[PDB]
Amino acid sequence: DSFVIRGDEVRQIAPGQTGKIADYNYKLPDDFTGCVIAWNSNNLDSKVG
Amino acid sequence: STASALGKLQNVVNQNAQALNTLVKQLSSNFGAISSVLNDILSRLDPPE
């Protein structure tokens, strides 16, 4: 599963988390097995306009 | 007139009653948790702890 989020919201992508992204957009199971990968694309996904 | 001649049966009854009473009493202990009642724990913390 792929998406783009703000820099400060990456903390909410974890089992048993609470916030705004974790409960309204993407909810993870408590016993989730797998892995999470995150990197930065300010030079690609952000524009001067 | 003379009492205390039937100590054995009274002792058996007292032992049974005391064992049941202490088994019931044990419900109020803490056992190292934050409270002795489940509802307060459920209604004051998120599931992870």
Swiss-Prot record, chain A:
Recorded superkingdom: Viruses
Region (Integrin-binding motif): 6-8
Consequence the record notes for mutating V48P: In strain: Omicron/XBB.1.5, Omicron/EG.5.1
Substitution effect: N43K: In strain: Omicron/BA.1, Omicron/BA.2, Omicron/BA.2.12.1, Omicron/BA.2.75, Omicron/BA.4, Omicron/BA.5, Omicron/BQ.1.1, Omicron/XBB.1.5, Omicron/EG.5.1
Effect upon mutating K20T: In strain: Gamma/P.1
Effect the entry attributes to changing K20N: In strain: Beta/B.1.351, Omicron/BA.1, Omicron/BA.2, Omicron/BA.2.12.1, Omicron/BA.2.75, Omicron/BA.4, Omicron/BA.5, Omicron/BQ.1.1, Omicron/XBB.1.5, Omicron/EG.5.1; May enhance affinity to human ACE2 receptor
Subunit-level organization: Binds to host ACE2. RBD also interacts with the N-linked glycan on 'Asn-90' of ACE2. Cleavage of S generates a polybasic C-terminal sequence on S1 that binds to host Neuropilin-1 (NRP1) and Neuropilin-2 (NRP2) receptors. Interacts with host integrin alpha-5/beta-1 (ITGA5:ITGB1) and with ACE2 in complex with integrin alpha-5/beta-1 (ITGA5:ITGB1). May interact via cytoplasmic c-terminus with M protein. May interact (via N-terminus) with host bilirubin and biliverdin, thereby preventing antibody binding to the SARS-CoV-2 spike NTD via an allosteric mechanism.
Purpose of the protein: Attaches the virion to the cell membrane by interacting with host receptor, initiating the infection. The major receptor is host ACE2. When S2/S2' has been cleaved, binding to the receptor triggers direct fusion at the cell membrane. When S2/S2' has not been cleaved, binding to the receptor results in internalization of the virus by endocytosis using host TFRC and GRM2 and leading to fusion of the virion membrane with the host endosomal membrane. Alternatively, may use NRP1/NRP2 and integrin as entry receptors.
Protein name: Spike protein S1
Gene name for this UniProt entry: S
